[PDB]
Amino acid sequence: GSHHVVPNVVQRLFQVKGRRVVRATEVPVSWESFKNGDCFILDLGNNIHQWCGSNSNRYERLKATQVSKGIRDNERSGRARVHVSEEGTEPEAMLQVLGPKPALPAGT
Ligand SMILES: [Ca+2]
Ligand SMILES: [Cl-]
Numbered sequence: 812g813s814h815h816v817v818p819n820v821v822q823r824l825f826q827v828k829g830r831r832v833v834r835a836t837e838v839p840v841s842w843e844s845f846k847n848g849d850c851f852i853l854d855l856g857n858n859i860h861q862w863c864g865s866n867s868n869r870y871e872r873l874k875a876t877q878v879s880k881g882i883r884d885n886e887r888s889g890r891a892r893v894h895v896s897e898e899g900t901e902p903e904a905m906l907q908v909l910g911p912k913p914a915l916p917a918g919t
Contacts, residue, residue, distance in 0.1 A: 822908060825852040825878060833874040842909050847898060850875035853905060854882055859893045860905050 824840045827833060827850040835852070838844040845851055847864035850871045861879040863872050876895075883891045896902060906912065 820856060822856075823854040825854070826850075827852065827871050827875045827878060829874075830868060830870055833870045835874065835878050840909070842913050845913075852878050852882070853908065855904070855908060857887075857891055858904065859883060859891050860902070861893055861895045862901065862905075863895075863897050865898045 822840045824838050824844055825835045826838045826844065826846075827835050828846075828848075838851075840853070845862070845864070848866040850861070850863040850867045852875060853860040853862065859879045859882055861875050863875060867875075879893045883889060883893055894902060894904075896905070901912065
């Protein structure tokens with residue numbers, strides 16, 4: 812019809828962590844939640860950002876892919892796009908959501 816005036820889903824962040832047992836758990840959407848030893852999945856609805864820290868292990872990296880693709884396929888009927896980045900290669904879209912990055916420790 813001519814006017815759509817009655818309303819009406821939110822950003823989420825998942826931590827992917829473990830070795831023997833790799834677990835995905837929801838955490839606050841914030842840079843403060845990120846850790847260099849794990850992988851994180853930032854669900855923005857139409858885009859999913861998959862980020863692995865420099866010290867993440869292979870099982871976390873594999874599980875992170877499974878989680879990203881699971882949201883894409885099971886929740887977004889395959890239409891959301893997945894972007895893999897890592898520590899230091901984050902795309903501008905992540906910074907728009909999460910704001911300025913945590914500074915690196917002096918002397919890198
Ligand atoms: Ca880890
Ligand atoms: Cl991308």
